[PDB]
Structure formats: C-alpha cells, structure tokens
Amino acid sequence: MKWFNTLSHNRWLEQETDRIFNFGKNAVVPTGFGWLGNKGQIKEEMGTHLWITARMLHVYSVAASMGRPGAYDLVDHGIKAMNGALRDKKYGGWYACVNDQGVVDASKQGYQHFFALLGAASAVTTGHPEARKLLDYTIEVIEKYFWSEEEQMCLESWDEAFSQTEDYRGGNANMHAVEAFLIVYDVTHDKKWLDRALRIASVIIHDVARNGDYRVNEHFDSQWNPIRDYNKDNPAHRFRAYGGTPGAWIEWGRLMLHLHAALEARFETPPAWLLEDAKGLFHATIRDAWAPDGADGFVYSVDWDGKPIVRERVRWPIVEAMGTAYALYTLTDDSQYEEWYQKWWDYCIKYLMDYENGSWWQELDADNKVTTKVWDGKQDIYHLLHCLVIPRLPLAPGLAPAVAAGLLDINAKHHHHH
Amino acid sequence: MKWFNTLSHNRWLEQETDRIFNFGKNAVVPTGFGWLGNKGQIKEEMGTHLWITARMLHVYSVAASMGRPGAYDLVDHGIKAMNGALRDKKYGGWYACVNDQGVVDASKQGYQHFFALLGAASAVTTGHPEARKLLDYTIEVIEKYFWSEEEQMCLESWDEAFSQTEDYRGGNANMHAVEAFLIVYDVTHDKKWLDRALRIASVIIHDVARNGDYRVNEHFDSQWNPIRDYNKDNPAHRFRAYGGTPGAWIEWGRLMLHLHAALEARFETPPAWLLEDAKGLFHATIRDAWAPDGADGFVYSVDWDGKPIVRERVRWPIVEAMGTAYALYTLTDDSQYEEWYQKWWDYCIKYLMDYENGSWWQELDADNKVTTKVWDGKQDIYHLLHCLVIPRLPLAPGLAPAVAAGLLDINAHHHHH
Amino acid sequence: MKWFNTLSHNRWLEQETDRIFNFGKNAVVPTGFGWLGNKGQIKEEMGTHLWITARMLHVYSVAASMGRPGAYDLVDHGIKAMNGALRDKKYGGWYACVNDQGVVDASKQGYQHFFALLGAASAVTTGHPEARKLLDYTIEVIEKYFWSEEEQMCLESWDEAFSQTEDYRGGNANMHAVEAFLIVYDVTHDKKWLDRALRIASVIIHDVARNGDYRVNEHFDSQWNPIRDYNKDNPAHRFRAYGGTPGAWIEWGRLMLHLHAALEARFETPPAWLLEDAKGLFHATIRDAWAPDGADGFVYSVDWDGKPIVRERVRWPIVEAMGTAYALYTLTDDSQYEEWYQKWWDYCIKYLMDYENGSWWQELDADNKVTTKVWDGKQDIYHLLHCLVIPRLPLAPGLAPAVAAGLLDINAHHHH
Amino acid sequence: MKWFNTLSHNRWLEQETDRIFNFGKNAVVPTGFGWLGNKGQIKEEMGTHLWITARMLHVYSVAASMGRPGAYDLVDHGIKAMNGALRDKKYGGWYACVNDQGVVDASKQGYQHFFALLGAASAVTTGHPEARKLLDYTIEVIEKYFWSEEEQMCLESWDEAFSQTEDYRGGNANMHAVEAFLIVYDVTHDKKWLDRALRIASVIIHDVARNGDYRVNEHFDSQWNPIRDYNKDNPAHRFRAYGGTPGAWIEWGRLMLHLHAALEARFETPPAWLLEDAKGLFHATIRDAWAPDGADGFVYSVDWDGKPIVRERVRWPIVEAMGTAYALYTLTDDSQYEEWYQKWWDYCIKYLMDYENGSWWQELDADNKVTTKVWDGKQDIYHLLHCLVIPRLPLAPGLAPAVAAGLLDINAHHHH
Ligand SMILES: OC[C@H]1O[C@@H](O)[C@@H](O)[C@@H](O)[C@@H]1O
Ligand SMILES: OC[C@H]1O[C@@H](O)[C@@H](O)[C@@H](O)[C@@H]1O
Ligand SMILES: OC[C@H]1O[C@@H](O)[C@@H](O)[C@@H](O)[C@@H]1O
Ligand SMILES: OC[C@H]1O[C@@H](O)[C@@H](O)[C@@H](O)[C@@H]1O
C-alpha cells in the first residue's frame, strides 16, 4: 500500500492538520499561549509557559504559510508575547512561566530557550516585520548563556539573574537545540548553526548512544559523564525520565536526517554516520519500546537493558516515530518504513485521535485507555506537525522554511510496480 | 457543463466518499460486519452476512489505498472474518449468515461467494500479508463449486455440505461473477478470468438480452433456458425480482466496458458488441425505467413489455446508472452521458443523500419520499463507490487495483474544442 | 508570506466556499429565493426580492460549474422564478418584490434589473436549455428601458408600467451594469457590451471620481450632474448612502480590471486609465475608510472631505476590498496588495465569519461587534464569491465563464 | 496507434516546423517577400506578390510567438512591406505584384486582400506596434470593396482604380475570407466577423456543395449562379481549376470546425450543420480524390461526376487533408481520422518532404514523381503550418492567436 507522496493521503493529512490548528486557537491568553485541557479549555492555574508560547508561535507560522486566515494574527500575538511579560527586562532572556498577575517561574531554562529560538526562526519565514529582530535578540541570549564555547555543547539552565548555571547537562535540551539550530541555519546560513548541530549529535548520539545499542543517555554531569541512575526515584518525570526514553531516540533519528539533507542541499556529501545512527535509533526504539508488554503502542521509558519502566503510551513518542519513518523511507526507499508509518497511523486513529473533544489524547495506560499520569491535559499541538506536515515536505530546508517556500506535496508526483 | 475529469467535481466526490467510509465503520462486529440501520446503528437481528462482510472488505481495501488511517484495520478485520466464524471449517467455503451463537444460514450462495472473490481480490491490492492466501483459497472454492466447466457459466447455490446444487441459474450471481473476475484478472494477469467474463456476458447479454430489446432475463433453468414467470408471487424480492430489473441492466453495461478496456489495455481489439450492447442496455434502462410514472427516478422492476411493476426507487439502480453514464462518456465522448450523470446527481442529493442521519436512504416510494418496502435499513455502502470513486478512474484496471496503482484523478478550456 | 496562487490557500478558499453554498440553499421558496436571517432561516415578511433571486441564480450557476450536486436544480429553480411571479408578463421586465399572495413592490428597478442580466448571463455558462432564452429576453428589457442611447448611460428606475422614469441617475446601478455587461460580453461578443461598460466607467470614474480625489459620486440629476447632498436626511440608506460609500469605490476598481483583462484577451491594449484609476480607487479607500476611527475595519460611508459618517462595518465592503487587492496584485505584481488581502482575511475570520450559525455576519458596530442597524439578517452570499472564487481565477473571462471554462486554480516562491 | 496529443509526435512536428521556418527566411527582398524556387533561392523574375508577402507576414508572426530569434524582424519586414511599394497610395488597397522599379500587376485581387487581412490579424498577435494600424486599414479596404453588404458575400477583384469589379464570384476567395475573418474575430472579439464567416459557409457549403454530393462549386456568375464549365480551356489553373478541387473541399471542412469552436467558446451552441458538412466534405474528398487512379495521393481536380481531371499531386491538398483530419478527430474522437492523418504523414515523408534541397516538393506527377506542371518553385510555407502547428493547438482561438496565448501542446492512452 502506497501512502507517502500520494495526494489522497496528503489531503487526509491536511484536513486533520486544520482540525489541529483549530484546537490550539483556544490557547490565546494576554501574555502568550495557555495550557489547554482535555476539552480544549484553558487551565488558568498553569499560566503561560515559555516553551508552550514559543511552540505555538512556531505552529502558527506554519499555519500562516499554509494560507489559513487568523494564523498570522497568532504569529503576531506570539511575537508580542516574546517581547512582553515573558521577557526579563532586567537580566535578559525569558522567564519560564508567567501570567497576567506576574512571574511564577523566573528561572532561565535552556530547553525552553531553544524553543524560543525555534519559534523566532520559524516566525522569520512568515515575513512578519518584527520576527528577524526577535531572532537576532534570541541568538544573543543563546550565545551568551546556552551555547558553551568551552564545552562545545549546550548548557542546561540558570537562575533568573544568570549568576549560577545548573550542575547538570541534558541530552533533551541539546536535542531541541539541534532542532532549533537547523531552522536558524535555514534562515541565516551562518555556518556555525549547522556545525553546532553536527557537533551535538556527534557527542550525544554517535559517541554515547551508539555505544549503548542506541539507547540514548540523557543525563550527564557538568563534565559530560553519564549519570545512569538520574531520577531513579522520579522515573515518570515529564522532561528527565529515568533511563532511556525511546520517543526521544526516534526523534533524534529524524533530526539527524534533516542534518544529512541540509548538507546534501549545499552539494556536500554528508558523513555516513548520520543515516547509520538514524537507522540504529529507529531500530532500537521498536526493539525495546514497541508493544513490549502484550499490547500495541510505544512505552514511555526503559531501563538500560531495554526493559520497560513507565509503560504509559504518551502521545509524542509515536508521533515522532511516524515522522522518522517518513524521513527514513525518504532516504532509503525501503518500504518497511512506510509499513511502520501506516501501522502507527491505524493505531493513532484507533486510540489517540479525539474527534469528540478535539485534538488527540495526551496519554494512555498500558491497555491503551485514556489515563492521567505523566501529563495533565492536551497542552501541545507542535509535535503533531511532525506526522501531519513533515510527510508532505522534503527534508531540506526544514519544516517552516519548506512550507513558506511552497514545497507542500512537491514530491507527490503505477506505484505497485517498476 | 463539465464535471467529469474536473478536479472541482472530483474533490466533492472524495469528500462525500469520506462521509460514506465513516458511516460503514460502525458495522464492525466480532464475526465480521453487521447490518446498519437508518441511523447508523447495528440491527443485531440481521446477523453477520457473507455478502455484507465481503463487500465491506472490498470497500475498506479502497479506503486503505486512499491513505485513510483505520481502513487497513478494517481490511484486517474482514480477512479475519473470512478466516473465522463465516468460514465453514467442516465443508469449506462460507456460510451465508452467522451470529455470535452460531450459524444462521448455512447455505453456500454463489452470489455471495462471488462477493467473497471480489473482496479477496481487492484486498490483494492493499498488500495485506494474508490477502493472497485468501484469494487463492477463494479461487479454489469458486472453481470447485461455482464456475461450471461443463456449462461455461456460474452455478447458483449449494447446501452447506455441497451435496447438491440448486436447480436454477441466475443472471444476478453471474453478473457479480463478471465483476469479481475482472478484478481477479487485474491481480493475476491470467486471461482465463477475462475469457470467463466475456463468455458470461455473451450468453446473458449478447444472446438473451439483446434479442429481448435489451431487457435482461435473470431467471433460467439448469439448461440456461429463461424462466419468464419466476417469482411472479414475490415480485419485490431483493435479489430475484419478477421480470426485469433495470438497475441490473445498466450495471451489466458498465461491467462490459471494464471488459472492453481490459482487452484494449493488452492491445487486443475488443469485440464491438461490448460497447454496442452497453449502449443498448443504458438506452433500454432509461426507456423503460426512468420517470415512467409522472415523477423522476428509476423504478425497481418492469414486465417484459417494459411496463413498471415495482415502482419504488431503490438506491443502487440510480447509483449504478451514474457509474455507467461515466463509463459510456469515457468510451464515446458523447456529452448526453455526462448530462444524465449530472441530472442523476441532482436527484441523489435532493432525495437520497441523508446528511441528518448518515449515508443515503436505501429506498423511496413512487413520489420519491422515504419508505420501507423492498429493503430494511442502510446496510450497503459498496455500490456508492461506483458513483463516487469510479468517475475518478480509468476503466482499466478496475476499481481497487486502479486506486492502489495511484490512478485517482489521472484524467483530471473544456467548454470548447 | 505567499497565499495568492497557492494550492494550500486555494483549498482553504474552496472549503469555505462550500460552507457558503450550503447556507444559501435554505433560501429556496416557490417564487424564487427568500431573505435569510442570522440562522439561515427565511424571513417571510421580506418576501421574494428580484435582486436576491437574480444573485442566487448567479451564485448557483458558479456552484454548478464547480461540480456541486443540487446546484443546477437551484439554477433551474432561479430560471423558473424569472419566468414566474417575478416576471411582469403584462408590462415587461420584473417586479422588485413578490410573495405567495401577489406583487409586493411593482416598480422596475434598474439596480435589480442589472442583477437579472448578470444572473441570466451566468446561467448561460451552465448550458441550462432555458438560460439563453432568459438572457435574450433580459437584454431586450435592458436595451428598451435601462440603457439610454441618448445619454450613453443607464437609467435608474421606472414605475410598473414603464411610463415614467425616475428623476435621478445612479452610480450604483451603473456599476452593477458594468459588472453584468462584462459577463454578457463573455457569452456573446457583441462588442457593444464592453463599449458600454468602458463608457460608463469613463463617466463615473475617469471623469467625476478621479477629479474628486477618487471619491466616487453616486447621486446625479437627469443631466448627469452630481447631487452632493442627496440623502443627507437618510445617510445610512442601504443602496444610496449620503456622501461616499468606499466599498463601492474599491468594487469599481476590480470591475475596471476585469474590463482591462477582457481587452487584453482579444489582443488589444487596454486604455491606461483603467489600471491608473483602479489604483486610485484602492488607495482612496484605504485613505478614507480603513480603520479611520481607532479600530480595524472599513466604515460604510464618508463625507466629501473623507471623514467617516456611518461607521458600521458592513460585510460587503471588506469582501470587495479583498477581491480588488487580488486584481491589483495580478496586474502589478506588487506584494503590498497581497499584504492587504492577508490582513483583511485575518480580520474577517476574527470578526465576520460565523462558524456557529453559518455564513458571515452582515454588519458590525464601530467596535467590530455584531449588530443590527443598517441591515437585517444574512440575505446575501453573492459578494462572498469575490473573495472566495475570484482569487482562484484569471481576470478574463469573468467569474462564471472562467469557472465553466475549468480555470479554477489555473495560476496556482519565497525568492526569484 | 496514438499520435495526436502526444508530446513525442508534437516534438517531431516542432522540429520539422523549424526546418520550414528556416527555408522561408531566404525570401526576404526589399519590397516584401519573393518567390522561392526548388533549392530555396529567389525566383527574382516573379517579383513581390501580395499573397506571398501577406502569407509570410502570417507565418513569421507564428514563428515569433514561438520564440524564434529573427522571426520578429520578418514580421517587421512584412508590416513595412505592406506600407511600402505594395500599398496603392492613390486608390487604396494593395497592388497584386510589384518589383524594385514599380508596379507589375496593379489589379486589386480579393483573394490576395483576404490574405492581407489574415497577415495583419496574425501580426496583431505579436504585439508589433504598427500591426493594429495595418489591420484597421485592411478592414476599411475589405469593407469598402471586398465584402458586399448587398450580396452578403465577398466580391472577387477590381481594377487598380476600383472603378469596375470582375464579373465573377469565387468560392476560393470566399474560403480565404472565412479563414481571415476567424482571426479578425479573435483579435476584435467582435460578432460581425463570425456572422460573416457563417453566412459565407452557409452559401458555398451548406447550400451549394451539400446539394452536389459535397463537391464544392467554386465558379459563380455575378448573381451567384454556378458556372459549371468555367476554365474548361484552362483546367490546371492555379487558383480557378475547372470542376472541383478536392483540396479546397477538405480545407473548407477545417474552417467550419474553427467556426464551430469559436461559437462554443462564447457558450453558444453551434449549428449542427458545421460538423455535419465538415464530415461530408472530408468523406467526399477521399471518395473522389484519394488514390483514384492506381497510386496513392490526392489528385488536383475532378469533374462533377467525381472523375479525376488534373491528376498531379500538388502539395497543399494533402497538407490541408491532414489539418482537417486533426480537426475532425478533435470534434468526434473517432480514430478513423487519426488513421488517415498517419497514412498521409507516411505518404508526405515518402514523396513530398525534401531533406536534400529544403522544404517540401510542390508538385508530383500521377506516379508520385517530382514534376513541374501546375506550379513552379516552392513559394509557400503557409499551408504547412496546418499540418505542423494546427495539430498542437485547440480549434479556438485560431492559429496565430492560440500560439501567442501559449496554447502549444496544451492538450498533450492505449485504453480507456
Ligand atoms: O512535548 C514535550 C516532550 O517533547 C519531547 O520532544 C521531549 O523533549 C520530551 O522530554 C518532552 O516531554
Ligand atoms: O446491493 C444489492 C443489490 O446489488 C445489485 O447489484 C443486484 O445484485 C441486486 O439484485 C441486489 O439486490
Ligand atoms: O449587496 C448589496 C450592496 O451591493 C453593493 O455592491 C452596492 O451596490 C451596495 O449599495 C449594496 O448595498
Ligand atoms: O497555396 C495556394 C492554394 O491555396 C489554396 O488554399 C487554394 O486557394 C488554392 O486555389 C491555391 O492555389
């Protein structure tokens, strides 16, 4: 069965994408974007998070490029929010969480600042007259506090006043740095952004993960030595789970293929390890995490021997798996990847898609029934673009640049025989 | 006005197709696919029919090839049903009807086995790893019990244990054999299937129908002699109506054009009678059955002088008419066929389409008001692909193969030359 | 940001178009098309208006050409209606308004007859076997009573019997004559239709509007001299507002560019003033009417110095502005026009589109909140095709002909 | 076998088209275009003929629209020529033939003036700044002297001073009037040219030819009564052959289908007889004139019982047959027309194409061997566009307009 690069499948994806764009519109709050619950209501107690606001700015940049009325107003809202309450006008950068009445979390989180970077870079592709100013400012914050020239890797977090950095180094924030750096590169061609991306991946993936059967180590000390037992007593942490989180492995895989494609796009032969390691991560994710416990789905985390720990099926791991299947199919022409993509789509409509309340469920238990454990509500639509829009685009340039360039369905041009 | 081979019209068709796919999803039951009612609910008392289950397997094969998440799971469900409760594990083939408790109708119905053949052949086009095995098994059953080598025609039915065949021969079962054989040909490229289809059409249409003003005779004895009086006392029978059923005539017309196109595809000149007789069937259907009684719509049945008998407007006849209009337009380029297609679409949205309760009504009275008489519920969506998907495809290969091949919209200043 | 001539934007446009076609279907009544309210219900007390019936005939002609089942039945219904109760079978032409009991308004309104002409011409593009007959008759009525050979302009209205014409000449009726004449030209090529359209535009726009900073004068006496203070006492009139109605200025702009494109289509160099004056009208509209009073949106009317009078934001002016932005973008390649189009789409979804009850609101107050003041319900869908379908087509031939020709998306990018 | 609307066939067509364009370029002379011989040199003794200069103006208009460097210079050359020595500044219109020291044939030939009209209308499609002026003037001459309002038909010829008209009416000149009128229509979108074309075809074809087994009568007296024995003593005349000339019958067929398509293009139902009679003419041409005498090819003339008179195979009849086969295929979708087109292409390359000396031979004997009898030289490339370019275009608008519109290969399969 052929779905990739078919207009019939791609029309289905677009129509679902519009349903998703509609869901996120409910998140608009004066200081940015709020946290949506299971019925698409704002959970006011959660306030305005930096990472959510930046993600929505990115999402509505893509929607704007797709020619959807109202989306550009959300881009504008996003850019205003990044210049408003979220912005620390004393020490620079952005607070982690604010609301109409003040700052709740003033800390300076690297993970969230890389999303700020992605949001600004994607906003630039819309031509919004204030987007490039925002990007330039974000670059200054990143280079001052979050890219380490000494370590040639990303730092994790600081206090409000940028006086003390966290005694921890994280694969997760570094992963989203790679993601953001790809798009910054697409809207600058300052070579350093791609160089930095390759460097980060070489350390986290080609060195550490590859040497552990492609089980990505996320937690390191300040000297970049793995802390294997980090969070052993808080294993279901939302951002720093104990052990391996296979959803991240497979996401890394796709990011490495965007890097491969960006190198190809400047007529450079990419290093072979990008594709090799992307295959490795994909294979490892299925090996350990797909249906390991008597029911379909991807578990949330595994121990260092591949045994599941948190068995809940969170939404984003399978969504990322679908994106990576597409990226691997694109580079390999191997139908096995398409078969996995299809299998996962069937699972998604069966268990995760929520036509009744809107969007998709965020989390299921080990029997694939809606649960509340790891998460609380439906606060994200950003990951969904990776299974809804990415499969309609080349791998270079990246998501927002490629949509703005008019590349949707560009490759959808007798597929049962040769 | 141009609709055929326009992306605007074809987009509308696709959007309606998705509405129809959605309606059929609630038919899923442990033993296969159940019988949906007017509001999309399962009518439990009807059980799990072989023909319905096989048709759904076919429909969701097309949906799967169209890239709809969930459709492949329904293909898988259908294949499991065909390997499970519906399959006669003792004597082979498939029971006509089952439920959770056991067998409701143990008979071995040719009509329904030809749908099993279609369903398996369409499933093959999805690449499902169990589909070819199913097709192989279905072919074995068909050649053992339902294609007669001596008659060079299809048998009608057997009892559960295949001890004796029915003393009756049917144009209806044979029509759906042609339909299935076309698709088996597409997934085998073995001319024997097309040889058989052409042979069947040559007897029922080119001989008997053509010599009867294109009024197709459906009921025959075992020597393939017409029984003109069959079911006089049960005229509104769902599968064996008394007299002629014009919806069937026009359906035969399309099938003959698929056959024509299949021959052309391998650079063989089709016999001229396929097109000639398709024209005759289409014309005769309009002649006897279109608006014959002071209101629009196709009547269900007519006597041998063309006079209406059962005057209800059932859904499938007009749907088939629309499919045949497309096929004839494709072969002739004659705009009259497109005009009919358009007129029929307008009728369908006015009277048949049911946006309130789902799908389309199954049956209307002679004033085009919803009724319950010949039928009971909304158990079919298979026919609707003939007015929704067929117009988006060439005539060769057939429906499911062509969608799998990526041919949707391939043919799409058209107000002048 | 690129939207014009992109399949992603055009798909969004088509899907909204279908939503709009669905809303109008509820307007069917035995005598034509009735007046839809905010819920898509018929407002029976409004009866069956000639202008509404003719507009719906036009709208469903386009829907039919787009391959929508049922639309042709609505064309058929409109044609029957134009041969039924609405037709004055005694004196000729069509009554302004009828109902199931008889004639409500027997007068013969030029404005509404030009819509009859448009409807018939659009219907011809469907091939409906009674459409050409309707067009031919409509042309006869227009040439007898509405196109003046002595004035080389359109007359305004008459009594039922066509015995006395109104002592008034109108820019508004003449504008919609231009619109109708373009489509009659498309389905005939009697040159006179384009000649007449150019003549009308040359008087109302090139002479009078251009000389008044592109503020179109609508109200004239029988000698075609402006009546500047017409309807001072009734400034929010639905068809003859006091002063300038900027939505009409921008509508004139687009029509002139359809005229331009028609001339190009036959390998003729169009007169330069069509584009020059389209630019002038567009600019003047932004200058006087866009967000002139501390909130977004187009006001309804302005005085002769460009100051707002009626500040309500009616639906059709912004819808027409979007159409004209597309036309100007097409001719100039200047992205400022695309930027305006996008800005206005954002405003429309924010304030005008009504996904709850259907269609779009007809009218908002000066703070962009839905109101009832100038208008009453949701009786029109015709204008919406100018921001939904027009951006998917070339400028020649016109709307219904172009859709019938299969030209949707024919023209459908961050660097050179 | 499928050729029509295939890119592979159309590429072959374009490549031959370029070889043909190249051959014509040597015809440039100071006063217009000269008469090319068998090896592509100028037959200087023939001087500059109006019909040749006008045809070359048309051909290079098409070449220019196709983006061939040098072609526009020839369009400019042709326009200058039509304003130079060929132009009668005293009495108006154009002399039939001039040379570098004066007028050779001062007569005012209708046949040649309809080609002047075609050449000007085609030149307008290139946007050359002097082309519209030329067309406008040519129209004035045609309407003064060559279209008769009284007869509703075209006259044949006049003396230099337009004092007396020839006591003769010709189906040939009228055929080329139809041809020219189609293109004038295309660059004016004005009804009257099509009305005139339809009227002309209705008389020559629907009345006279249809009632004589589709054998077109060409020679008429001043009352439009046939002269059946005209040119009995000069049967092989180049423009007025005795009896019927089947090449002309099949050419009429295509022109009627361009007429049909033009009507369709403005959403008008064309009269059924255009297609009926086009089929009739095509069939009759094969019936009487295709391989009638034991070898392939179309004879030049037949008598009124269909028997061949002049048996030479001149180039243009089969070239026109091929164009008509395309037009009939386009309207009917009947493969028999494509089969004939293919058969004729095979004959053309076997016997007519001249890769050695350039272009195609003008004339063969009854055994398909190159001969000199009816004609002398290779002065024409105009007909060749009817088998080289026409099969790559829709039937409306006509040749030069369609190429200028970007329509080449727009329509470009073993089963249904
Ligand atoms: O959407 C939130 C999730 O995003 C993924 O890419 C990872 O960064 C996870 O750690 C995180 O919980
Ligand atoms: O959908 C069921 C119908 O299918 C048609 O093709 C015919 O076989 C009818 O006899 C039958 O009732
Ligand atoms: O839709 C109704 C409106 O149409 C516009 O084009 C103008 O004619 C207005 O005066 C009128 O109120
Ligand atoms: O090319 C010259 C020829 O052109 C044809 O169309 C006819 O007019 C002939 O009579 C003429 O000899």
Curated annotation (Swiss-Prot), chain A:
Protein name: Sulfoquinovose isomerase
List of residues binding 6-sulfo-beta-D-quinovose: R55, Y111, N172, H176, R238, E251, Q362, Q379, H383
Positions annotated as active site in the UniProt record: A248 (proton donor/acceptor), H383 (proton donor/acceptor)
Pfam families, sorted: GlcNAc_2-epim
Catalytic activity: 6-sulfo-beta-D-quinovose = 6-deoxy-6-sulfo-D-fructose; 6-sulfo-beta-D-quinovose = 6-sulfo-D-rhamnose
Organism placement in taxonomy: Bacteria, Pseudomonadati, Pseudomonadota, Gammaproteobacteria, Enterobacterales
Biological source species: Salmonella typhimurium (strain LT2 / SGSC1412 / ATCC 700720)
Complex and partners: Homohexamer.
Keywords, alphabetical: Carbohydrate metabolism, Isomerase
